[PDB]
Amino acid sequence: FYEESKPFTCLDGTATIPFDQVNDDYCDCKDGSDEPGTAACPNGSFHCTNTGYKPLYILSSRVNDGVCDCCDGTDEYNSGTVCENTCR
Ligand SMILES: [Ca+2]
Ligand SMILES: [Ca+2]
């Protein structure tokens, strides 16, 4: 009748979790692949999309650290620091 969506598998094959454990602010994958958008994994990376300009990757520990790391300011989305777009 209703088919269920498949779960997420860590890019390193170390675990399979439902997609509600993706970006849930707890590190479930040894490679950090379940938390690309948060500061939860010690070896993760956050992608600065920097729309219109060169994209950059930063350490996950720099997501919501209150410091402006991406020129588009997208790394600071719930920290209290409001970053201005400085890509130009
Ligand atoms: Ca997680
Ligand atoms: Ca930051």
User: Do 88 and 48 share a structural domain?
Assistant: yes
User: Do 83 and 48 share a structural domain?
Assistant: yes
* Ligand in nearest proximity to the CA of 46: 2
Look at the chain and report how many structural domains it folds into. 2
User: Do 15 and 3 share a structural domain?
Assistant: yes
Compute CA distances 49 → 16, 64, 69, 72, 80, whole Å: 27, 16, 12, 8, 21
User: Do 62 and 30 share a structural domain?
Assistant: no
* Ligand in nearest proximity to the CA of 82: 2
Q: Which range of residues forms the domain containing residue 75? A: 44-88
24: which residues sit within 8 A by CB, 6+ positions away?
A: 34, 35, 38
- Binding site, residues? 20-21, 24, 26, 28, 34-35, 62, 65, 67, 69, 75-76
Could you give the CA distance from residue 23 to residue 39 in angstroms, rounded to a whole number? 9
Q: What is the CATH number of the domain that holds 23?
A: 4.10.400.10
Resolution, expressed in angstroms to one decimal: 1.7
